[model samples]
Target: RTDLLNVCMDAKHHKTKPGPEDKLHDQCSPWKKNACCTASTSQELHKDTSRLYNFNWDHCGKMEPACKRHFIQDTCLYECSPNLGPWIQQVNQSWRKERFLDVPLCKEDCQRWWEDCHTSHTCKSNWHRGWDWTSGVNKCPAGALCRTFESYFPTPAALCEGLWSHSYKVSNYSRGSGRCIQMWFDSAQGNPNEEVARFYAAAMH
Candidate 1:
């Protein structure tokens, strides 16, 4: 759920043991804003981080929702739109190999998935409108995208567990990079006052 600032800042520290607060201060000075704390936006405290962060922030804001949420069920249906079983097989087959998560692969995965699914037709030249996963909400798929699992963007696994309303499609187009696709589905009634689908989609989106 954490944003790009958090991801870019802490990625080096990912899964590593915590360093003393002093060390953190030394390492993340401009971002940490002296010896005290980290700013939520990075831009909030300084113009440098702010400018870079803002560029990514705004871009992500638009793209994340578009690909992660708006395209949720549709993305899945697009791939599985033709045949669910074969689509699953294609994804599984690719998942068996190891590959660096580069932009070319990203495009390749999207293209291949589209082509594989639309076996009888030519694949669309573009799946996303532009470069998204590297910056925006949809920057990466839901599952592989991360700041902190607890932060905000719901991971694909979280969506699948029904912890969030949206679930990833069966094809792991974004999963190659460890990113997750957003999920969408119905839930059982709980509060008469609550609108389940709308609320859940909102949260995930």
Candidate 2:
């Protein structure tokens, strides 16, 4: 997908000298930072920038790893919040049924499973365990890639229980821990903006 978009952009640039329609490209230069298409008029560029954007699979490919991490963190909070336990358990049940799997656990036999199932031995079992949960939770949409990363926390138990328990208490037993989860989600500090930029770069001529 990324390659195809770049090819299309290159094709656009290879076209002959500007026609009258090409004048719109210059008009969009000032606001080009936000506009997806270079050949858009100022009015069109404003419309592009002003409206809400619907991110597609290409954007998802770039954002998936960070989003997955954020989602795991959210799950951690959900698991630890006593008030939110019912909702969390409900979601967990639904997910397990949909996926036809047992409740996910950070098992002691992770190393055995890793050795039996995987060829790559660079990452430890904990990394794969966290990745399994993240991958299951934030399954990528069609045409998107689910890029994996090393887990931020040590293990699934640490993230789902240890951190959640500690943070929940620190927040003074707050009921709306969802807000904190959202903060992490919104501020997924990594390459999200850069990914959006790449998405626009690929989309624009």
Candidate 3:
């Protein structure tokens, strides 16, 4: 009976409830029938520069398109998906009270993300909260230096697990295994993560 949809409160650009967003852009369109994020958020996520948190995928420099795709998929999953119930943890942070942490990400997703981006450059290993926002968008912190992803992440698991402060953990399972979450999927297959979340919620209770 765990068939409800819930969205985060105070998360930037999130709706209070999951609902139809027929025009969600690009990778986010998979959640069009039931989305937690606005179409505007979806659109902004695909841009190299946007007002959405003023976040830039190219803070260190121009990231490769291949590398950027994974970040968009990750954000679409985080901002649009409604099936992350089991991992939603309560926090005292003013920006958001509820946040999902340690979601079991499928191995292939993590590996492929790392594979595509490992050669790219970045200022910070973790993309969650270490940037300077003084000029509106994020700037590399004064003491930091840009380096290859290899310099920051030694393995796929390291990048996936640490990128967002452990919001995702690389699962032993692969995509379509039904034991982990896939960052990108065919919408026609329905949301595989709903059952994954339900399974975890069942185990948790």
Candidate 2, 110-151: lDDT as tens digits: 222223222111222122122223332323334333333223
Report the number of the highest-TM-score candidate.
Answer: 3
lDDT by residue for model 3 over 98-171, one digit each (tens)? 77788999999999999999768988888887889888888899778999998889899889998988989989
| Winner on lDDT (1 vs 3) | 3
Q: Cα lDDT of all candidates, in order?
A: 0.25, 0.26, 0.84
Instruction: Return the lDDT, model 2, position 96.
Output: 30
Total clashing pairs for each candidate: 23, 0, 0
* TM-score of every candidate relative to the true structure: 0.16, 0.18, 0.93
TM-score, candidate number 1: 0.16
lDDT of 1 by residue, 1-205 (tens): 1121111111211212212232222213211212122222221322211332232322222323233322333322221111111112111222122111111112333433333232121111122233244553323343333233223323333223222121123334342332322222222322111222233233444
Task: Give the total clashing residue pairs for model 3.
Answer: 0
User: Cα deviation in Å at residue 86, candidate 1?
Assistant: 37
Give per-residue lDDT, candidate 1, residue 54: 31
